[PDB]
Amino acid sequence: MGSMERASLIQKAKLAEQAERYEDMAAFMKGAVEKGEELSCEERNLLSVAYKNVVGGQRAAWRVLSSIEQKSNGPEVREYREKVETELQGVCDTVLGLLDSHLIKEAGDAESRVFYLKMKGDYYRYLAEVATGDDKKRIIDSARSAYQEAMDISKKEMPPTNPIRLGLALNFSVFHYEIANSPEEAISLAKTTFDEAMADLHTLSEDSYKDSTLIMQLLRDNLTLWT
Template structure:
């Protein structure tokens, strides 16, 4: 499968299959620059008794150490303590869970690929059969971890963040995040659960789009990131390349038209996401043309 870029806060480490390593935009590139301050004297297991300020510093330290589970725990505690997050705190929360869930998504794709290849062999020995069973059990273990992470994030969004968000920017950010995590559930779910996750993801993205069009400039990095991830949803989850291309093309062209009005503070973030939109659009267009030229190789399309 071709890889393409998607965004999570800025980015989905893999929005190519969303996160198949195609989200080549590092979340740190899109989020605010944070000071490289090393925090000392932080006791293990102090999350539940720490102040909000201590928890935020702990999250920053965990990010520097690339201990994203610890980072997520700290920011979860911050959110439950006070859901009115600053931009920096909001980005810390997003980066933490993005990396936590991203590791499981990547693992799930690897194991699923091995499982599919092993299952393709019609004549299996007893050893092969055991391997197939082991692969299935391991995939299901990873799925359970991924689903639990997504459920935790969605619970934070529904119980604390969305209802308490006071600005259009934060509302769009959280609704986009909700769409992302339902999309991750849809990637691994089957039958009715998959349909439900797809429906919830699309509704969340659309609500965010409706708000962003009325309240945010086309060049705003959060609005652009939303368009990027929503277009990936259409392409990757709904298998609707035409809709994905239309969404990406419209977002890119609207931003280009107002590029001269772009705020200097967000110029780098916005142009990075615009480049991802254009890259995806180029890839998707070429894939669609290739399928049209050789329909026998794609009988289902």
């Protein structure tokens, strides 16, 4: 994408989303990041939407194949699960590489830095979902460390209803439950997040209230599933 203007890549990412062409969307956003400039709030959301949808489809396919493989236990199911797994790892490595070169280091405002560290935690979490080898513990710890740094900044710099702070807590709680084998930590985090957001809703406008309550409902949905 080196020969395409930044603004054209952003415009085409928006078109790709409307056309449900998420692989294209992600490629356009990778090209935009590689222009080297910081991303605005809207552009950060395009980057996240694109890769979350690409890896989300890979994760769903990996889970279908992993289920078939486990029931089976010729080489074909394992080979094909491995192929999908390698592709998934490649996309996660690409996102992590964009964050490391150089989105995080240039992000000084709390909103941008938390957003990118939340992404970093998420893509290490997706790597941890498929990990089995000598580095699996280190992948889990890399997710934990990114989420923890994001949490520390969010608690110092953002109100408890801020949607990025809430989504971060939601995802870190999923990490605790599904990756770290820490269901109590997951439940505690989701509960305290929900309750502290509830107590700050009175400060919000109607549109901000809608955003915060939407994520609070996701927290509540998980708590209902986990308890």
